[PDB]
Each structure stands twice: as structure tokens, then as C-alpha cells.
Amino acid sequence: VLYVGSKTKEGVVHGVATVAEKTKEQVTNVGGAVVTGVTAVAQKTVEGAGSIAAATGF
Amino acid sequence: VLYVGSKTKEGVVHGVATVAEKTKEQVTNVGGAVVTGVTAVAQKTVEGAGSIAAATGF
Amino acid sequence: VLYVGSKTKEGVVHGVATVAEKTKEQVTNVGGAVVTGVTAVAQKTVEGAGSIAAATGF
Amino acid sequence: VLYVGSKTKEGVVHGVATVAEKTKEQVTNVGGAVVTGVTAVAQKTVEGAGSIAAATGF
Amino acid sequence: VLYVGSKTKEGVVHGVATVAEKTKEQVTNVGGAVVTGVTAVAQKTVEGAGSIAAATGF
Amino acid sequence: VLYVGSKTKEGVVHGVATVAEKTKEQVTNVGGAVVTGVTAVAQKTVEGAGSIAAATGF
């Protein structure tokens, strides 16, 4: 609301360093969501919002 | 509400260093959500919001 | 509410260093959520919000 | 000398995962060797060879 | 000398994952060797060879 | 000397993943060697050769 010289880092992912030799991601879905591999979602304010993998269904 | 020179880190993931040689992620879903692999979700305010893997169903 | 020069780390995951040689994540769901692998969720204020693996069902 | 399908790991360091918040390495030498911080030397055959910190002197 | 389908890892360092927030390496030498910070030397055959920090002197 | 279908990794460093926020390397030498920061030397055959920080002196 009122900052007088601060330093903020609200809602941050910092450093996802990753090392791999092989990678075989094998997804076969039908009617839903799938998210694989590296993922670095970063939000500050989520006002009743969705997931990172949503499946509403019927 | 009022900062007079502080230093804040509200809602942060910092450092997800990872080392691997092989990786075989094998998902076969039908009607739901799946999230695999490295994941670094980082939020500050979640006002009644979703998960990181939601399955609403019927 | 009022900081006069403090240093805060409210809601932080710091350091998830991980070392592996092989990895075989094998999920086969039908109607629910699944989350595997490294995961570093980090939140500050969760006002009656969701999980990191939700299954609402009927 | 003769391998017929084995799997060997001769001379290996595997996994030096390390987590720290601060680090202040303060060396002031004059006439010798100094080695600090993380170190993961890994050799197989050392035929009368040197150290990882040698000081021959006069 | 003779491999018939093996899998070898002779002389390997694998995985030096490291996480830090601050780092202040302060070296002031005069006449010798200094090595600091992360270091991942990896050799197979060292036939009477040097160190990773040598100081021959007079 | 004779490989008939093997898979070798002789003399390898694999994965030096590193995460830091600050870094202040402050070296003031006079007559010797200094090596700081991340370092991933990787050799196979060192036939009586040098170090990674040599100081011959007089």
C-alpha cells in the first residue's frame, strides 16, 4: 500500500537450473489435462482462478 | 501496509537445482489432471483459488 | 502492517537441490488428480483455497 | 582386463548436493597452497601423482 | 583392455547441485596457489602429475 | 584397447547446477596463481602435467 524505499520480491521463482541426459515424456490422454516437463508458474494474486492442470468433466 | 526500508521475499521459491541422467515420464490418463516433472509454482495470495492439479468430476 | 527496516522471508522455499541417476514416473489415472516429481509450491496467504492435488468427485 | 557385459563405476563421486545461506571464505596465504569451498575430485588411477593441495617448500 | 558390451563410468563426477544465497570469497595471496568456489575436477589416469593447488616454492 | 559395443564415460564431469543470489569474489594476489568461481576441469590422461593452480616460485 505504501513503500518508502523497500525492496520486495513478491511472487517470484528464481533459479530452476536443471541438468539431464535423456528425457522421454510419453503422454496419451483422452479427456483431461496433462502438463509435464519443467514448469515454473509464478503468480502474485490469484483471485479464485484456475489451477495449472484443470479437468472440469461433465 | 507500510514499509519504511525493509527487504521482503513474500511468496518465493529460490533454488530448484536438479541433476538427472535419465527420465521416463509415462502418463496415460482418461478424465483427470496429471502434472509431473519439475514444478516450481510460487504464489503470494490465493483467495479461494484452484489447486495445481484439479479434478472437478461430475 | 508496519516495518521499520526489518528483513522478512514470509512464505519461502529455499533450496531443493536434488541428484538422481534414473527416474521412471508411471501414472495411469482415471478420474482424479495426480502430481509427481519434484514440486516446490510456495504461498503466503491461502484464504480458503485449493490443495496441490484436488479431487472433487461427484 | 576382460568384461563380458558388466556395469562398472570405477572411481566416481555421485551426488554432492549442498544447500547454504551465507558463505564467507577468507584465505590469506603466503607461500603454500589452499583449496576451499565445495570440491569433488574424482580419479581412477593415480600413479605416484600429486595431492589436491601440495606445498613443496624449500 | 577388452570390453564385450559393458557400460563403464571410469573417472566421473556426476551431480554437484548447489544452492546458496550469498557468497564472499576474499583471497589475498603472495606467492602460492589458491583455488576456491565450486570445483569438480575429474580425471582418469594421473601418471605422476600435479595437484589441484601446487606451490613449488624455492 | 578393444571395445565391442560398450558405452564408456571415461573422464567426465556431468552436472554442476548451481544457484546463487549474490557473489563477491575479491582476489588481490602478488606473485602466485588464483582460481575462483565455478570450475569444471575434466581430463582423461594427465601424463605428468600441471595442476589447476600452479605457483613455480624461484
From Swiss-Prot, chains A, B, C, D, E, F:
Q: Where are the sequence repeats?
A: 6-20, 21-31
Task: Give the Phosphoserine positions (modified residues).
Answer: S51
The name this protein goes by in its record = Alpha-synuclein
As for subcellular location, the record says: Cytoplasm; Membrane; Nucleus; Synapse
Tissues in which the UniProt entry reports expression: Highly expressed in presynaptic terminals in the central nervous system. Expressed principally in brain.
Ranges where the record places region 4 X 11 AA tandem repeats of [EGS]-K-T-K-[EQ]-[GQ]-V-X(4): 1-31
Q: Which organism is it from?
A: Homo sapiens (Human)
Resulting phenotype, Y3F: No effect on osmotic stress-induced phosphorylation
